[PDB]
From a paper:
Selenophosphate synthetase (SEPHS) is a key enzyme in the Sec pathway, being responsible for catalyzing the formation of the active selenium donor for this reaction, selenophosphate, from selenide and ATP. Our group previously showed that trypanosomatids conserve only one selenophosphate synthetase, SEPHS2 (SPS2), containing a catalytic cysteine. Like E. coli SEPHS (SelD), but in contrast with its H. sapiens orthologs, trypanosomatid SEPHS2 is not a selenoprotein itself. In this paper, we focused on the trypanosomatid selenophosphate synthetase, a key enzyme in the selenocysteine pathway that is responsible for catalyzing the formation of the biological form of selenium, selenophosphate, for selenocysteine biosynthesis.
We determined the crystal structure of an N-terminally truncated selenophosphate synthetase from [name] (ΔN-LmSEPHS2) consisting of an AIRS-like fold also conserved in E. coli, A. aeolicus and H. sapiens orthologs. ΔN-LmSEPHS2 crystallized as a monomer in the asymmetric unit showing a typical aminoimidazole ribonucleotide synthetase (AIRS)-like fold, which consists of two α+β domains labeled N- and C-terminal AIRS (AIRS and AIRS_C, respectively) ranging from amino acid residues 74 to 190 and 204 to 384, respectively. The N-terminal AIRS domain folds into a six-stranded β-sheet flanked by two α-helices and one 310-helix, while the AIRS_C domain also presents a six-stranded β-sheet that is flanked by seven α-helices and one 310-helix. Similarly, the apo ΔN-LmSEPHS2 crystal structure lacks a 69-amino acid residues-long N-terminal region that includes a glycine-rich loop, where the conserved catalytic residues Cys46 and Lys49 are located. An elongated dimer model of ΔN-LmSEPHS2 was generated using PDBePISA as a likely quaternary structure, stable in solution with a 3230 Å2 buried surface. The dimerization surface occurs mainly between the β2 and β5 strands of adjacent monomers and is also stabilized by hydrophobic interactions between side chains, leading to the formation of an eight-stranded β-barrel. The dimeric structure of ΔN-LmSEPHS2 conserves two symmetrically arranged ATP-binding sites, formed along the interface between AIRS and AIRS-C domains in each monomer. Our dimeric model of LmSEPHS2 contains two equivalent unbound active sites in an open conformation prior to ATP and metal binding, similar to what is observed in the apo E. coli and A. aeolicus SEPHS structures. We showed that the crystallized construct (ΔN-LmSEPHS2) does not complement selenoprotein biosynthesis in SEPHS deficient E. coli WL400(DE3) strain, as expected due to the lack of catalytic residues.
Author numbering:
A (entry chain A), B (entry chain A): 6 to 310, 313 to 330
The structure:
């Protein structure tokens, strides 16, 4: 979800230009600060990528530096976050050209991403979605579980000893956490670049509301305003980190992963296509150019019957695709 | 100070386009929340106006809502800040099209302002400034003093009773505070609109570093990078709220108003012109279109001799223009 603003300028051919901007933030764990920065930047860019815009013109970095650390610790942490944020901006072929850092009792890492585009250079997230369309997800789910288990290694909770220790090893937790953070810092840029090519009908990114929450918002957005559609996103199968699923079952689905509401940070794109043929071709080209990272067809869009505010559903007995 | 980013688009005539963006924030006092919002927005726009860009394409609002207040108080405060912020955006002929609100122990009100412009639609803040140029300031100084005296009426400090009470009345303090907040919520938009018309050589806005701090940064900026100039901004006379000056003298210049380092929020533009004739014409047209708000010629630019990092100075025995 971005802001899309018509400008009082056209391009060289007299075509309308638009300023597309987005902002986001995340609360980092006590962890590798360079990595925090990378995830912070990928999270900001993710929203722009969901508009089918692979080229970001510039970024602003917004950072809250914690008053808890001593000067030495705070200085190196801030420096490393900045470096990691900038490293992802370089990978995105953009630059960080401004922003601000403030002292604050709680840390925060976020920013703003902006692109100036013509209509031909984006894919609008409303107005294209139809019943029958096929849904694909470009990153696996379960990062909230991953981050919390890793946290418990350095600063344990009673739940860790009660339900986790002895059943899921520090090595399996290390591997889950590495898979999750590797996935989180990855850009959705290649996905954005391929959306138009395969006739995508729009996308949303998956962040703090979980797969089902963001699916719901994507569906609900089609019901505003002047030319509404009444649609329901049906999730039939979902890619989830295997160890995150195992951990969830040991903790009575504490983080609501299996319910569809577990928070992701810098999650994947949930993209719609007009057919399975189109969706499969997008997935095939995406894995081939983006380092062999799989994507998954996860369901379809149907006509909405229905309960107020409900525009997405998890199918009863949906398939879990263990990753 | 903004970010100015060349875009891979031209306008209808094949002229280069640039994305100019800026961000800023302020820590609001316990006060009228609608007014907090208005000052917050004017503060964000001020930086864009300093680039001679009177038309803002869009704004994002970034707000930190305090965890200190109870739900009822927080909800109405947040609502009123939002309304005040939006009211100034309407006055600026722009819209707030996105942003974010976060819970936080400390309140903050800020945002982002963006414009897409050609070279002909802005005035760059480096590269035009010359020795001999005349400096003008478009809002009076002393808001930090004003805000703190008003604060002491509802939540007193020992300094208030020691040095203020009995010498500066609650009515004089009310008047100083009203003058200061009236000035702070005013947009620098008309100033921006008139800069090019009179051949301005760039501007900076005046915010948290005080008149001398921002003058210094404006001068120092000319020394980077490929085509540097060595210049010194000389401040010869300064407009200051009369009561703020009186209060300063009672408190041994506590807030450094007389030293030139008192923090302003949403202060005026410090603008350079090639001559006194040009400067006077700008001032005359600005007061005529912007509700009769005075502006002042405050000094000039000279060749820099000098101490490292020093690119501005207050003249010994400079004139205080009481407002």
């Amino acid at each position: 979800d971005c802001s899309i603003v018509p400008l009082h300028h056209t391009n060289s051919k007299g075509e309308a230009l638009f300023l597309v901007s987005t902002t986001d933030f995340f609360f980092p764990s006590v962890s590798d600060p360079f990595l925090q920065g990378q995830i912070g930047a990928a999270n900001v860019l993710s929203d722009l990528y969901s508009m089918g815009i692979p080229d970001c013109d510039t970024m602003l970095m917004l950072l809250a530096a914690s008053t808890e650390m001593d000067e030495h610790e705070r200085l190196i942490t801030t420096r490393e976050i900045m470096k990691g944020f900038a490293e992802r901006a370089r990978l995105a072929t953009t630059t960080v050209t401004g922003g601000q850092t403030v002292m604050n009792p709680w840390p925060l890492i976020g920013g703003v991403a902006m692109a100036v585009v013509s209509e031909a250079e984006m894919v609008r997230p409303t107005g294209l979605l139809c019943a029958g369309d096929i849904l694909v997800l470009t990153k696996p789910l379960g990062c909230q579980v991953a981050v919390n288990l890793k946290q418990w290694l350095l600063r344990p909770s009673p739940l860790y000893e009660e339900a986790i220790a002895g059943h899921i090893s520090p090595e399996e937790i290390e591997e889950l956490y590495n898979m999750a953070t590797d996935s989180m810092r990855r850009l959705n840029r290649e996905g954005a670049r391929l959306m138009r090519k395969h006739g995508a009908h729009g996308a949303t990114d998956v962040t703090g509301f979980g797969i089902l929450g963001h699916a719901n918002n994507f569906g609900a957005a089609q019901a505003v305003g002047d030319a509404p559609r009444s649609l329901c996103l049906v999730l039939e199968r979902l890619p989830m980190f295997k160890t995150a699923v195992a951990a969830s079952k040991q903790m009575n689905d504490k983080y609501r992963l299996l319910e569809g509401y577990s928070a992701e940070t810098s999650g994947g794109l949930l993209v719609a296509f007009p057919s399975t043929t189109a969706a499969a071709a997008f997935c095939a080209e995406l894995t081939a150019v983006d380092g062999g990272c799989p994507s998954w067809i996860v369901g379809h869009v149907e006509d909405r019957a229905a309960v107020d505010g409900v525009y997405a559903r998890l199918k009863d007995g949906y398939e879990i695709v263990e990753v």
